Design a binder for this molecule. Structure first.
Ligand SMILES: CCCCCCCCCCCCCCCCCC(=O)OC[C@H](COP(=O)([O-])OCC(O)COP(=O)([O-])OC[C@@H](COC(=O)CCCCCCCCCCCCCCCCC)OC(=O)CCCCCCCCCCCCCCCCC)OC(=O)CCCCCCCCCCCCCCCCC
Ligand code: BCL
Ligand code: BCL
Ligand code: BCL
Ligand SMILES: CC[C@H]1c2cc3[nH]c4c(c3C)C(=O)[C@H](C(=O)OC)c4c3nc(cc4[nH]c(cc(n2)[C@@H]1C)c(C(C)=O)c4C)[C@@H](C)[C@@H]3CCC(=O)OC/C=C(\C)CCC[C@H](C)CCC[C@H](C)CCCC(C)C
Ligand SMILES: CC[C@H]1c2cc3[nH]c4c(c3C)C(=O)[C@H](C(=O)OC)c4c3nc(cc4[nH]c(cc(n2)[C@@H]1C)c(C(C)=O)c4C)[C@@H](C)[C@@H]3CCC(=O)OC/C=C(\C)CCC[C@H](C)CCC[C@H](C)CCCC(C)C
Ligand SMILES: COC1=C(OC)C(=O)C(C/C=C(\C)CC/C=C(\C)CC/C=C(\C)CC/C=C(\C)CC/C=C(\C)CC/C=C(\C)CC/C=C(\C)CC/C=C(\C)CC/C=C(\C)CCC=C(C)C)=C(C)C1=O
Ligand SMILES: COC(C)(C)C/C=C/C(C)=C/C=C/C(C)=C/C=C/C(C)=C/C=C\C=C(C)\C=C\C=C(/C)CC/C=C(\C)CCC=C(C)C
Ligand SMILES: CCCCCCCCCCCC[N+](C)(C)[O-]
Ligand SMILES: CCCCCCCCCCCC[N+](C)(C)[O-]
Ligand SMILES: CCCCCCCCCCCC[N+](C)(C)[O-]
Ligand SMILES: CCCCCCCCCCCC[N+](C)(C)[O-]
Ligand SMILES: CCCCCCCCCCCC[N+](C)(C)[O-]
Ligand SMILES: [Cl-]
Ligand SMILES: [Fe+3]
Lengths: 301, 281, 240
């Protein structure tokens, strides 16, 4: 009994340069190498990639964010490479102290460098968002990827920008460090009277859970009907096959209702986007509207 | 009633136990022997939770809580009122979950499809059995198990976590979280991609899988492909739950101190342990 | 207070989203029918959505769903009981009749096209220059059935050009005709291809394709249906 988790045989042909539509081919790179390792699990072809104005801006801006944090880590490590690797997880680029409020006047060593790194990150993510929209437009596809990415950006924006502004200081924002961003998360809950009493945190968990539930169900289902070409989802949408019928009936007979080949992808996009949508609201309301979720929960108001 | 295409699939056979005895449907629901076992275990479990509500003196669903035996009882049986009901409910829950999986196997056999779905569900059962059976037994008391109550089970999560300091520092917990976050990223992208191809700009033809591969190559220089993304989703979500089970089986057994202190293995490696500067010197 | 207004608003949104999602998932297979094919009295609480139209590429027309549903094929089954909810027994050979796990759907008798309007799936012999890049090359291997008898030998791989993957093995039988086997239902071993689904005597019955260098969506369903059906219907001839 073959399970179809790994391919038994790889076949290779000419590098695929992709569909043209309204894409400016001048901005496409050449193909990269074929990976036999990747080819056991999915596609072997690396590249081409598309890199126009927004791509270069996003990539340079992203590297400047990453390097800015790195330079601070080196400074904290006293330029010793042994201390750098020893204390990597413990280094932290902290935002400005509460004193400085929402001013850009803080010195480099006490939150100025946090603001510079944050500026670079802000540009990197937003230009990357523009790129997800425009790459879809060039191919005549719907903007589903750009709208789904906006749900992730919402929670990020709330954590680093919108909530700090509404609280009146950058000190409320997340520090750039491995262990420090974990300590911040733990602290945020203690200070707001335990996020388990935040009903939006409860919903966010339900969707995070539900995303693993749904991708386990959907992935297992498509592998179970791959013996009838089930993973060819677009043609199964245009012209329902026995794959789509058996997939539906498995679930109808198990739990009393079922999806369509198109409809399961609507369940999928919404289960995932509701994670960061509900999450962002839960965080936005914490400290701005609700000081203590235990206390709020005792009144339900 | 039947889906328009359903009748041709409703043939006899595929049962694991009892031949044609339970080989029927009730509305959309397939029964089989494990349909009967599921109903029996679920009905018995619900009655025992009701009987627990009586002894506790509340019918409010947000207050009902069935607690395991106190630590003093160890791995022994306990009186119904103080942990026995929890023990019997836990056997009923295990029976209902395993029966549900084996019913999925019978449905797989009748439809001539692979067994990936019940195999995937078995990982969720493992996680449940880690918390209520494997960890308690290795620690020597049922009382380390979680209570069956909407809010009291969250109280248990909070108390169990903070027993070891900030539970963020459990390294298996870090890996589990990474798989949960990555799974949600991948599910959003997969749903978005297929819908963006099936529902293009107004008035344009349906896009092809070639457009889907092209979109991702343009965006990130790599497309895993249509088979690949379903393999990936299955692996991310099962990996999340595997590492979840692992992060709890090692907690209170091989490691029972603060998780933050575990990371001193790295800091105290001889070659950089004593060098001045940084955070840890 | 604002948090209370937000959570209440969220639950109303969530109820509307579930309504929208459920009605979108009724675009195929509804309305519900009785066992005799007549519309069922109880259709449930959700109404059928307003139709949507897909414009298919390469001038293949449109699909409007929901729309008139029919099997567009004879179903060789009979009731085993005088009340609803029991199995329907095959009246002939369920492998040949295409019922139960051997079922196929009357898909279009056209091949799936790639984004350029070319046949998606071709024999590797007609696909320049596709080749086996990794793993055991199955071409030339004998093909064994679940009765552990040799049914034929592999003479080619049929490849998805755009997705660069093996989809079918082309097997030559004792009479020099060929059949397609789905790649997902064979085990490639060092010295043979093993097929658990079918005994050697059931290979001749695999539905044939009408053109030697292409396979239609209809043909793929008949082939894949027939092979999966062997898990149940070839079980008497399966050794261990
Ligand atoms: C924070 C930001 C988070 C945004 C998350 C958006 C998720 C994206 C989902 C989606 O379908 O995106 C594609 C969808 C359309 O993509 P397209 O490429 O323009 O169209 C391609 C096809 O022609 C057409 O493609 P299609 O057919 O796939 O698109 C149809 C789509 C169109 O979807 C929409 O129109 C978006 C719906 C609004 C989403 C905003 C949610 C806000 C949450 C409120 C919570 C309250 C808290 C207090 O329909 C729906 O999904 C219906 C949603 C049902 C809502 C139920 C309302 C309940 C009312 C209660 C009574 O995106 C949008 O509609 C843009 C949304 C922008 C919002 C800002
Ligand atoms: C997994 C690690 C922890 C845990 C930590 C947390 C944290 C943290 C939270 C929850 C929350 C929930 N937990 Mg919990 N929870 C645990 C184990 C369980 C088990 C179990 C193993 O049997 C169950 C049934 C639940 C069930 C629940 C729900 C009441 C709630 C939302 C779950 C969800 O949407 O998931 C995804 C599944 C779906 C979307 C499918 C739908 C499943 C439905 C909704 C489950 C209903 C269960 C029902 C009330 C049980 C009684 C029914 C019987 C027949 C009588 N938890 C263990 C001990 N749980 C959240 C909450 O809001 O609590 C108040 C929350 O914030
Ligand atoms: C002690 C700690 C507290 C706690 C404090 C918090 C705080 C604080 C928060 C959460 C949040 C969440 N908590 Mg909690 N939480 C607790 C206990 C739990 C438990 C449990 C007990 O089992 C669970 C399951 C959860 C689960 C969750 C999630 C549902 C939610 C995060 C969703 C998400 O996807 O963010 C991950 C996704 C993002 C952060 C989006 C990021 C998007 C950006 C755009 C990506 C940029 C990439 C960048 C450019 C880098 C490039 C990388 C390279 C290219 C490789 N918490 C306890 C009570 N929790 C978050 C939330 O929403 O709460 C309402 C949050 O802010
Ligand atoms: C203060 C609390 C601590 C903390 C303490 C703990 C403790 C303690 C635990 C976790 C566990 C987890 N933590 Mg933690 N955790 C914290 C902060 C976080 C944060 C965060 C953003 O800060 C995140 C994202 C997480 C994430 C996680 C996950 C990796 C994991 C829970 C998923 C799981 O096990 O599913 C597994 C899924 C199940 C067990 C569900 C099984 C479902 C069964 C099989 C079927 C039920 C059917 C139902 C009854 C039927 C209903 C009826 C029908 C609807 C009709 N934690 C903080 C620091 N965390 C848990 C874990 O790993 O458990 C193994 C765990 O015990
Ligand atoms: C539905 C919510 C989930 C989600 C969705 C989501 N994320 C997304 C998208 C979507 C729909 C994209 O389209 C976009 C993307 O391009 O995906 C490949 C992205 C993305 N989500 C990413 C990361 C990410 N998402 C996360 C979370 C989530 N994303 C949620 C769980 C997290 C977590 C858990 O913290 C991370 C770390 C990136 C891979 C990508 C955005 C890329 C970006 O903005 O790049 C800017 C920076 C650089 C170009 C340089 C990086 C520096 C060097 C290391 C190189
Ligand atoms: C392994 C990856 C993820 C996953 C996968 C997964 N889950 C699955 C499946 C798969 C593949 C199914 O096939 C199966 C299904 O049918 O889904 C619709 C299922 C399923 N996962 C479910 C729930 C579920 N899964 C969860 C998690 C996950 N499932 C993982 C994240 C969670 C979480 C995160 O908490 C929940 C709540 C169900 C909807 C369903 C299984 C239904 C089932 O087993 O039915 C039989 C049992 C009953 C009818 C109820 C019996 C009642 C008991 C006797 C008494 C109650 C005991 C219980 C301990 C009470 C505790 C309550 C308190 C904690 C509040
Ligand atoms: C592409 O393919 C696919 C499909 O279709 C083409 C699909 O449908 C699905 C399935 C997915 C969906 C329909 C999307 C929605 C699903 C979820 C969000 C997952 C969560 C599900 C639930 C909360 C429902 C849970 C309900 C259950 C378990 C039913 C229990 C109720 C009963 C009354 C039965 C219990 C008792 C027994 C024993 C059974 C009956 C027996 C007797 C009466 C005896 C997937 C994954 C898929 O990928
Ligand atoms: C080895 O040496 C090299 C050279 C390679 C350098 C090494 C680099 C290293 C080791 C870097 C490591 C980086 C790490 C570990 C980073 C981790 C980051 C984490 C965990 C971040 C977590 C959360 C971040 C959030 C929520 C940030 C949100 C930011 C925003 C929303 C932007 C807000 C913008 C602000 C405040 C300014 C805007 C200003 C104007 C004028 C608009
Ligand atoms: C997740 C991406 C990387 C996956 C790489 C895993 C390699 C698996 C190798 C499989 C071995 C080949 N075999 C025997 C299955 O044919
Ligand atoms: C997710 C990581 C994958 C990255 C793959 C990108 C491949 C880049 C191709 C480089 C080829 C450049 N050039 C100009 C020589 O053709
Ligand atoms: C795509 C929609 C799926 C619906 C799933 C809903 C799960 C309900 C979770 C209940 C949690 C409520 N709580 C306690 C946080 O207020
Ligand atoms: C709060 C989440 C729990 C939801 C449980 C509901 C399960 C849906 C069952 C649908 C069956 C309806 N029926 C029998 C008319 O087909
Ligand atoms: C966790 C939320 C998911 C459950 C949503 C409930 C949907 C029930 C749909 C029942 C459809 C039954 N029927 C007769 C139309 O086939
Ligand atoms: Cl694993
Ligand atoms: Fe899919």
């Amino acid at each position: 009994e073959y399970q179809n988790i790994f391919s038994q045989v790889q076949v290779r042909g000419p590098a695929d340069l992709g569909m043209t539509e309204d894409v400016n081919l001048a901005n496409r790179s050449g193909v990269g190498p074929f990976s036999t390792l990747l080819g056991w699990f999915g596609n072997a072809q690396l590249g081409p990639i598309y890199l126009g104005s927004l791509g270069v801006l996003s990539l340079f801006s992203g590297l400047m964010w990453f390097f800015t944090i790195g330079i601070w880590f080196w400074y904290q490590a006293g330029w010793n490479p042994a201390v750098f690797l020893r204390d990597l997880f413990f280094f932290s680029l902290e935002p400005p102290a509460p004193e400085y409020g929402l001013s850009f006047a803080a010195p480099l060593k006490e939150g100025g460098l946090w603001l510079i790194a944050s500026f670079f990150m802000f540009v990197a993510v937003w230009s990357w968002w523009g790129r997800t929209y425009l790459r879809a437009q060039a191919l005549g596809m719907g903007k589903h990827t750009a709208w789904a990415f906006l749900s992730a950006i919402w929670l990020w924006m709330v954590l680093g920008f919108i909530r700090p502004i509404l609280m009146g200081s950058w000190s409320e924002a997340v520090p750039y460090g491995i262990f420090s961003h974990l300590d911040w998360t733990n602290n945020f809950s203690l200070v707001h009277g335990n996020l388990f009493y935040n009903p939006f945190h409860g919903l966010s968990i339900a969707f995070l859970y539900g995303s693993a539930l749904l991708f386990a169900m959907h992935g297992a289902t498509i592998l179970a009907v791959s013996r009838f070409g089930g993973e060819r989802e677009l043609e199964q949408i245009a012209d329902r096959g026995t794959a789509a019928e058996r997939a539906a009936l498995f679930w109808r007979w198990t739990m009393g209702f079922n999806a369509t080949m198109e409809g399961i992808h609507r369940w999928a996009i919404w289960m995932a986007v509701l994670v960061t949508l509900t999450g962002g609201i839960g965080i936005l309301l914490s400290g701005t509207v609700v000081d203590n979720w235990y206390v709020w929960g005792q009144n339900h108001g | 009633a039947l889906l328009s295409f359903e009748r041709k699939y409703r043939v006899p056979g595929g049962t694991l136990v009892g031949g044609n005895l339970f080989d029927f449907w009730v509305g959309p629901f397939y029964v089989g022997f494990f349909g009967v076992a599921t109903f029996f275990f679920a009905a018995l479990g619900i009655i025992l939770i009701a009987w627990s509500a009586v002894l506790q003196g509340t019918w409010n669903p947000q207050l009902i809580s069935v607690y395991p035996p106190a630590l003093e009882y160890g791995l022994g049986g306990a009186p119904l009122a103080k942990g026995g009901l929890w023990q019997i409910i836990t056997i009923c829950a295990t029976g209902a979950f395993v029966s549900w999986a084996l019913r999925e196997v019978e449905i797989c056999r009748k439809l001539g499809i692979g067994y990936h779905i019940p195999f995937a569900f078995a990982f969720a059962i493992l996680a449940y059995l880690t918390l209520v059976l494997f960890r308690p037994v290795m620690m020597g008391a049922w009382g380390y198990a979680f209570p069956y109550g909407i809010w009291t089970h969250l109280d248990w999560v909070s108390n169990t976590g903070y027993t070891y300091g900030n539970f963020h520092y459990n390294p298996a917990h870090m890996i589990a979280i990474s798989f949960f976050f990555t799974n949600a990223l991948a599910l959003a992208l997969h749903g978005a991609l297929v819908l963006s191809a099936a529902n293009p700009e107004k008035g344009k033809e349906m896009r092809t899988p070639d457009h889907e591969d092209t979109f991702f190559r343009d965006l990130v220089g790599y497309s895993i492909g249509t088979l690949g993304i379903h393999r990936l989703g299955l692996l991310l979500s099962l990996s999340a739950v595997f590492f979840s089970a692992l992060c709890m089986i090692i907690t209170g057994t091989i490691w029972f101190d603060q998780w933050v202190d575990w990371w001193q293995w790295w800091v105290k490696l001889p070659w950089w342990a004593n060098i001045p500067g940084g955070i840890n010197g | 207070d604002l948090a209370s207004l937000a959570i209440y608003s969220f639950w109303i949104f969530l109820a509307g989203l579930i309504y929208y999602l459920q009605t979108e998932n009724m675009r195929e297979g509804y309305p519900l029918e009785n066992e005799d094919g007549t519309p069922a009295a109880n259709q449930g609480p959700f109404p059928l959505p307003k139709p949507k139209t897909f414009i298919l590429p390469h001038g293949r027309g449109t699909l409007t769903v929901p729309g008139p549903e029919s099997e567009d094929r004879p179903i060789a089954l009979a009731r085993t009981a005088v009340s609803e909810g029991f199995p329907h027994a095959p009246t002939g050979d369920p492998m040949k009749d295409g019922v139960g796990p051997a079922s196929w759907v009357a898909r279009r008798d056209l091949p799936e096209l790639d984004g350029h309007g070319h046949n998606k799936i071709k024999p590797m012999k007609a696909a320049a220059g596709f080749h086996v890049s990794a793993g055991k090359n199955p071409i030339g291997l004998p093909v064994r059935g679940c009765d552990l008898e040799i049914a034929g030998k592999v003479v080619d791989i049929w490849v998805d050009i755009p997705e660069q993957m093996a989809r079918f093995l082309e097997v030559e039988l004792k009479d020099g005709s060929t059949r397609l086997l789905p790649m997902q239902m064979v085990k490639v071993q060092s010295n043979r291809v093993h097929v658990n689904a079918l005994s050697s005597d059931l290979f001749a019955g695999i539905p044939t394709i009408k053109s030697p260098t292409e396979v239609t969506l209809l043909e793929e369903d008949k082939i894949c249906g027939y092979v999966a059906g062997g898990l149940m219907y070839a079980a008497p001839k399966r050794k261990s």
